[PDB]
Write a protein that binds this DNA or RNA. Structure first.
Ligand SMILES: [Mg+2]
Ligand SMILES: [Mg+2]
Ligand SMILES: [Mg+2]
Ligand SMILES: [Mg+2]
Ligand SMILES: [Mg+2]
Ligand SMILES: [Mg+2]
Ligand SMILES: [Mg+2]
Ligand SMILES: [Mg+2]
Ligand SMILES: [Mg+2]
Ligand SMILES: [Mg+2]
Ligand SMILES: [Mg+2]
Ligand SMILES: [Mg+2]
Ligand SMILES: [Mg+2]
Ligand SMILES: [Mg+2]
Ligand SMILES: [Mg+2]
Ligand SMILES: [Mg+2]
Ligand SMILES: [Mg+2]
Ligand SMILES: [Mg+2]
Ligand SMILES: [Mg+2]
Ligand SMILES: [Mg+2]
Ligand SMILES: [Mg+2]
Ligand SMILES: [Mg+2]
Ligand SMILES: [Mg+2]
Ligand SMILES: [Mg+2]
Ligand SMILES: [Mg+2]
Ligand SMILES: [Mg+2]
Ligand SMILES: [Mg+2]
Ligand SMILES: [Mg+2]
Ligand SMILES: [Mg+2]
Ligand SMILES: [Mg+2]
Ligand SMILES: [Mg+2]
Ligand SMILES: [Mg+2]
Ligand SMILES: [Mg+2]
Ligand SMILES: [Mg+2]
Ligand SMILES: [Mg+2]
Ligand SMILES: [Mg+2]
Ligand SMILES: [Zn+2]
Lengths: 308, 99, 108, 153, 238, 148
RNA sequence: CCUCAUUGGAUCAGGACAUCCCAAUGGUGUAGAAGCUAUUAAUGGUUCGUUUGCAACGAUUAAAGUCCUACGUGAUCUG
RNA sequence: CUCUUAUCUUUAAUCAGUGAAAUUGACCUUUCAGUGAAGAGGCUGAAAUAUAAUAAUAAGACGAGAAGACCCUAUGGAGCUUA
RNA sequence: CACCAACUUCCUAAACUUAAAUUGGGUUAAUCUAUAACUUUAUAGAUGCAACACUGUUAGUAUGAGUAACAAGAAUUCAAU
RNA sequence: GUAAGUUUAGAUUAUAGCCAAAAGAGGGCUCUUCUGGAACGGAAAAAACCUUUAAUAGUGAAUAAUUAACAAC
RNA sequence: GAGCUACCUAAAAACAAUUUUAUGAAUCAACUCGUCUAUGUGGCAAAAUAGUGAGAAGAUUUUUAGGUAGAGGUGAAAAGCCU
């Protein structure tokens, strides 16, 4: 037929070429990712010193899960594990184009296949010389903290003792009622209640002869962007690029999250101690220990706690 | 019923249109509409509002002369009233009597 | 709750001719190379499959005649042979189903 | 919310689901090629795979016998499972069942259908989707690329 | 309340076909009347080489008078004016005039110039069509070639060699078979007939005889596809 | 009824008055009955008034057709091609005489809403108003706030 | 000569401020602590039971405000 | 009940077949303040405003229904009791 | 130191001066009959003589709505197993 | 200054108003009498207030009423 | 018009098991009835369904045929019943 037809990467490939293309595409991922492993030796942009009021870039990480953790005081803290995975700087804007006072950096993590993606996204990455990433996000960065595109970022970018903010899409609950969506009391089970147990009561008053905008009603619950503020970093695993963040993080396991320094008033200028542009392992000024801990943390393999 | 009633509102709406267009044309030469209409009458010119609009749109040079004429008659009026007593009447304030 | 007003054809014509309610055109229709009949890309050909099942029913008919009753399933492998074919050494000790027709070209 | 649940709700309830799948499995073992609705055939495929594993355990295994006894309502099939199907699939580590989609049922319900079979059976081969030949234009260009890449290190 | 379900009964055939019915044959009280007989009493075999001749044939008929002239006597017995000398000309008049009707489609006149075995073989495949038949000069004069007789019918095959033009069109005026205006020479044998008994019987064109040794006719302009055998999944091609 | 009907502008057939005035009506057809009460008044029009009308209008061709008739009818044809038909059933001589004269004076142009009482092809003598008339120029044509 | 007949609750609450608690202040017959009076402010909050047919109490609270929305709200439910 | 929760079936929803009912002046069917008889999508003045569906809620259209209630009227009835 | 504005009035042509139960008068659609007319008319005589509305009657077709609601246990070699 | 009025003959319908203003009587309301009103303009929307002799065509004109108004030894 | 229902006449039927006794006694089926709640409300049904309940050898229940008729009949009186 002289009409539109559908195609996908595998339609015309033979049995042998099916394996060959798979190995080739994975081969390219290897070479491209090892080209960018050395930022400081590839014309790094000038590195300005830290000044008060600076905001540096953040990372995109995958949610591994939760585990228990203890402090030297014996308290148990439930902690979430975030893995920084194929995180690169992707695009830079200046203050003018972003229209904010501050500039913008777009980061991206969790490389994905190239086979079911629009041509537009693939061209964007081919210019940058990176395999495609699962998600983009935007970070507000001051001019001193700008980092050149194509620069990888690592869990060591964060250090134990700093507080952080995580934003991710919450678990979806589908279309829900009014009791489970907004915690409405509902109506009694017995004593004459007829076909009204979990229903909303009166919508509004009789006078206004309408329903106010923003009235809470049954609808689709979850799958929204939410942020958690002021989560402490208890430990960083440099070998696997794992960050231990106090408490709960929005989203399901294997959900990508946005990690950046906390914007709460208390920790206004705490990034003085942290690597200001970012943590460069290519610099190799000093080789980090595999596990970084916060001082209060009780490390395993230590003597059992005796509150003498 | 609407067609019959619009027949009489048509004549008042066109007069509103003519006045708006006349005010536009006179303000170009610096005259408010009341002054232009009144002082033209005092010169014994009986052009109506429909005809005045045609002059403004299609005869800009002739309309400009009328504005000067109406301004001159207005200027004469101020002098005549401002100077109390017997002062010779303005050249353009002369009224041609009929019998 | 009952309608307060009759709904006009102009209102109704917008509802039932909206694109959300129209039949979507299909891009996954293709031809079978062997028979030249139409098929969808991800589903088997309904004409070539029809050939196989009609032959399968014939074979299953013959199996029933050999068994002669319920609960007579063999404990050994089965094989189907067509006129002009004889069991090989590997075919020894396996139930043999015999078909009058010649070996079909597709069947191997 | 049905996140993470790995079963379809079929039949009159949980027990009815098992019995419906049990009959389909019994038919599959006897005939080795069955037509059912796509959803039901998909639900029964998992049990078809695991049943062969139990047969591999062996005739003398008591747990296999009890499981085989439950699932095969016709008891003549029990020798078939242990002495025919299991010997056939000794080499394989999995993927004993082949399931494909066939046109919609022409019976006024227009059900989505599937043909499920055990691999290696004696029936006429199904008309499977066959990939293109290496002689096609696109394949040759890819084949040309492969030769250069391997030969040049 | 309600209204009753009346069943509310080219339609009787379906009614009785679905229901099924015993249709006993009926003896027609009035015998059907035939003014012409299907077929030719004796199909004249055209001698080989009778064409491409650029009177000898008439002599051969005089020899066949044993089986033909006796029939002429019968033709005279009922009319006494049928002379094969003048008949050739009259035959042409029918032929030429009859074919001309097709242009106008004056089916009324044809019924008076052709029998009930030629009208269905002249108009049936021309409904929703606009033929244009014109007669160019006749190469050679017409000649009687065979006279046979059987209530009592007589057929006088005539041989004509003429040049004609045909330009059949579709409903939409598009050309379908022929050239708009180009003469072609044709040697066709026509079989006239008459109902001797009827007082109001005359000579009308009955049928035409096609020699096996005739050249093939001009083909249609359009190109045809002849479908091959259609096979159900059971069947296989051979 | 204005929005429910067509409209046009004031016009003349061929600039009728510029060079010479030409009468638009070009033909009158009157059909009558010799003996029919409805056509009595039309009959008197033929007896008395038809000839005088014909002489006054020498460019109008008049056809009078006495025939067995049910309604007497007047058909008027114009140069521009318009055709107008009138029932003359049971009308007096005065009415028919009045009607016939109205037809002669009319033009073939359709009697529908006329948008404007006036019409000119040369509306302006001194130049049509455009926004720049009554705007004074500037030295070197400098637009406002331009530095130069 | 006598007379007499819409409103609770549940759910969800929108609003007024003539402010019950929380917050900022003036005065005192304000030593401190408790209070009294007035200005300002509508911010979020303003409990659970028993006997009750309207009240009558118990134990709490920083407080258990006063009113308007056709008992605010019966095509949401109930006495 | 505090204080709700999980599972399964029904229904729901999507696909195929069949196919009602009350209801309906016309509708190209918005929010606020005013006016008004307790009263406004339609009036006055501001304001808001690409267009059509699908699934939900029930504030309003003094939403729709039944032979429901209440007072009064007729020189309209009827049952019952008597002094 | 005024302009604007309700045919209030003037002007060109005309016209002759103010909710509604009820009252006086002038025409007229349709059909039939008398006598005429002859592409559908005239003068008379007649009448079941004119409907945007009675929760009107009959029939038709919409709206609600392709909505509410309705139905066949499974596989196979199919008055079968 | 102006054109109506009485009698004779025939005849129905009507017999519950509405709001403003003025004077009384009962006791804010409620009775009684006197005056006006029933826009298409103005008063915001506006039956009852103010401007308005009937109803006509016109791409003329003059006008009426017209929610506006300019702390004080 | 008493094929429903009220009452009656005649001729016929049904009541297991268990405990008491010697029964308008007890527990509880079949059977008869219809207490309370929910569903349903153009419903499966113009009075039902699902549970829960009352009686269950008697003033019991059921079958067949006959009788009483509107100023009337019937009524363990609810002004009930009489298609
Ligand atoms: Mg609850
Ligand atoms: Mg419930
Ligand atoms: Mg509102
Ligand atoms: Mg005006
Ligand atoms: Mg619309
Ligand atoms: Mg889900
Ligand atoms: Mg799932
Ligand atoms: Mg509130
Ligand atoms: Mg206050
Ligand atoms: Mg309500
Ligand atoms: Mg509802
Ligand atoms: Mg459907
Ligand atoms: Mg709209
Ligand atoms: Mg309002
Ligand atoms: Mg508005
Ligand atoms: Mg739907
Ligand atoms: Mg509503
Ligand atoms: Mg009375
Ligand atoms: Mg009475
Ligand atoms: Mg007037
Ligand atoms: Mg009136
Ligand atoms: Mg009538
Ligand atoms: Mg009608
Ligand atoms: Mg109605
Ligand atoms: Mg009606
Ligand atoms: Mg419909
Ligand atoms: Mg609906
Ligand atoms: Mg449904
Ligand atoms: Mg009885
Ligand atoms: Mg017993
Ligand atoms: Mg007892
Ligand atoms: Mg009991
Ligand atoms: Mg008892
Ligand atoms: Mg009784
Ligand atoms: Mg009683
Ligand atoms: Mg009854
Ligand atoms: Zn095929």
């Amino acid at each position: 037929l002289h009409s539109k037809s559908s195609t996908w990467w595998d339609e015309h490939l033979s049995e042998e070429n099916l394996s060959f293309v798979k190995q080739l595409v994975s081969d390219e991922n290897k070479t491209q990712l090892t080209s960018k492993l050395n930022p400081l030796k590839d014309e790094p942009w000038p590195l300005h010193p830290w000044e008060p009021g600076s905001f540096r870039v953040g990372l995109i990480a995958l949610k591994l899960g939760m585990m228990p953790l203890w402090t030297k005081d014996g308290q148990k803290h439930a902690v979430t594990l975030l893995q920084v995975q194929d995180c690169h700087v992707l695009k830079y804007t200046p203050k003018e184009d972003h229209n904010g006072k501050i500039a913008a950096l777009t980061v991206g993590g969790k490389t994905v296949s190239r086979f079911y993606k629009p041509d537009s996204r693939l061209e964007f990455y081919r210019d940058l010389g990176l395999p495609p990433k699962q998600i983009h996000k935007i970070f507000h960065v001051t001019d001193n903290a700008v980092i050149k595109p194509g620069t990888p970022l690592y869990a060591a970018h964060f250090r134990p003792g700093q507080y952080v903010d995580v934003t991710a899409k919450t678990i979806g609950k589908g279309f829900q009622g009014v009791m489970k969506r907004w915690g409405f009391k509902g109506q009694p089970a017995s004593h004459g209640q007829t076909k009204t147990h979990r229903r909303p009561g009166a919508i509004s008053t009789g006078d206004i002869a309408r329903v106010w905008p923003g009235t809470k009603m049954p609808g689709r619950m979850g799958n929204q962007n939410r942020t958690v503020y002021g989560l402490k970093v208890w430990r960083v695993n440099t070998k696997h690029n794992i960050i231990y963040v106090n408490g709960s993080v929005p989203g399901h396991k294997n959900c990508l999250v946005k990690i950046k320094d906390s914007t709460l008033p208390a920790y206004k200028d705490s990034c003085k101690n942290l690597p200001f542009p970012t943590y460069f392992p290519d610099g190799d000024e000093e080789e980090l220990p595999e596990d970084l801990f916060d001082e209060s943390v009780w490390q395993p393999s230590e003597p059992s706690i005796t509150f003498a | 019923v609407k067609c019959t009633k619009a027949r009489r509102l048509k004549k008042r709406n066109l007069r509103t249109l003519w006045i708006n267009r006349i005010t536009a044309a006179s303000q170009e030469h610096g005259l408010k509409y009341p002054a232009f209409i009144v002082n033209l009458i005092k010169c014994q010119v009986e052009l109506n509002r429909k005809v005045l609009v045609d002059l403004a749109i299609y005869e800009p040079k002739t309309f400009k002369s009328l504005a000067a004429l109406a301004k001159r008659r207005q200027q004469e009026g101020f002098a005549a009233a401002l100077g109390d007593g017997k002062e010779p009447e303005g050249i353009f304030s002369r009224v041609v009597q009929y019998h | 709750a009952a309608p307060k007003n009759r709904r006009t054809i102009e209102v109704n014509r917008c509802r039932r001719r909206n694109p959300q309610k129209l039949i979507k055109i299909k891009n996954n229709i293709d031809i079978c190379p062997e028979c030249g009949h139409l098929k969808q890309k991800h589903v088997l050909c309904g004409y070539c499959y029809e050939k196989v099942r009609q032959e399968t029913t014939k074979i299953r008919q013959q199996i029933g005649a050999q068994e002669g009753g319920p609960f007579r399933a063999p404990s050994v492998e089965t094989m189907v042979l067509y006129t002009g074919e004889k069991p090989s050494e590997k075919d020894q000790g396996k139930r043999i189903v015999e078909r009058n027709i010649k070996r079909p070209s597709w069947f191997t | 919310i049905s996140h993470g649940r790995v079963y379809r709700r079929l039949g009159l309830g949980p027990e009815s689901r098992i019995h419906l799948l049990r009959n389909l499995l019994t038919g599959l073992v006897r005939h080795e090629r069955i037509e059912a609705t796509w959803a039901r055939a998909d639900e029964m495929r998992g049990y078809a795979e695991k049943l062969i594993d139990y047969g591999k355990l062996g005739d003398t295994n008591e747990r296999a016998m009890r499981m085989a006894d439950f699932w095969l309502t016709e008891k003549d099939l029990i020798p078939k499972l242990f002495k025919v199907l299991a010997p056939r699939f000794q080499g394989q580590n999995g993927n004993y069942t082949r399931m494909l989609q066939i046109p919609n049922r022409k019976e006024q319900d227009r059900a989505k259908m599937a043909v499920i079979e055990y691999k290696g059976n004696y029936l006429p081969p199904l008309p499977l989707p066959h990939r293109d030949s290496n002689l096609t234009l696109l394949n040759q260009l890819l084949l040309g690329l492969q030769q250069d890449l391997h030969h040049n290190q | 309340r309600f209204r009753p379900p009346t069943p509310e009964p080219k339609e009787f055939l379906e009614y009785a076909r679905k229901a099924g019915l015993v249709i006993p044959q009926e003896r027609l009280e009035r015998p059907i009347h035939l003014a012409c007989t299907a077929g030719i009493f004796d199909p004249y075999v055209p001698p080989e080489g009778d064409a491409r001749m650029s009177l000898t044939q008439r002599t051969e008929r005089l020899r066949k008078n044993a089986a033909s002239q006796l029939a002429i006597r019968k033709i005279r017995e009922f009319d006494a004016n049928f002379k094969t000398k003048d008949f050739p000309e009259k035959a042409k008049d029918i032929f030429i005039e009859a074919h001309l009707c097709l242009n106008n489609s004056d089916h009324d006149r044809l019924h008076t110039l052709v029998t009930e075995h030629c009208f269905p073989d002249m108009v049936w495949d021309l409904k929703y069509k606009t033929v244009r038949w014109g007669f160019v000069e006749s190469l050679e004069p017409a000649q009687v070639v065979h006279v046979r007789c059987s209530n009592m019918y007589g057929q006088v095959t005539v041989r004509l060699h003429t040049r004609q033009t045909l330009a059949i069109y579709d409903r939409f005026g598009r050309l379908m078979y022929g050239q708009e205006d180009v003469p072609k020479d044709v040697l066709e044998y026509v079989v006239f007939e008459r109902h001797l008994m009827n007082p109001y019987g005359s000579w009308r064109m009955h049928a035409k005889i096609v020699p096996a040794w005739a050249p093939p006719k001009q083909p249609i302009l359009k190109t045809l596809m002849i479908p091959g055998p259609q096979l159900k999944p059971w069947e296989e091609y051979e | 009824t204005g929005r429910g009907t067509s409209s046009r502008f004031l016009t003349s057939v061929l600039h009728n008055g510029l060079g010479r005035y030409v009468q638009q009506l070009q033909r009158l057809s009157l059909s009558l009955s010799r003996d029919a009460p409805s056509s009595r008044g039309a009959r008197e029009f033929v007896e008395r008034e038809v000839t005088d009308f014909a002489r006054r209008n020498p460019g109008v061709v008049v056809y009078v057709n006495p025939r067995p008739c049910a309604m007497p009818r007047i058909v008027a044809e114009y140069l521009n091609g318009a055709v107008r038909e009138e029932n003359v059933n049971s009308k007096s001589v005065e009415e028919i005489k009045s009607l016939v004269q109205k037809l002669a004076d009319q033009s073939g142009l359709d009697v529908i809403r006329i948008r404007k009482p006036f019409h000119t092809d040369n509306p302006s003598i001194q130049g049509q108003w455009h926004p720049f008339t009554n705007k004074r120029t500037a030295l070197h044509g400098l637009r406002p706030r331009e530095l130069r």
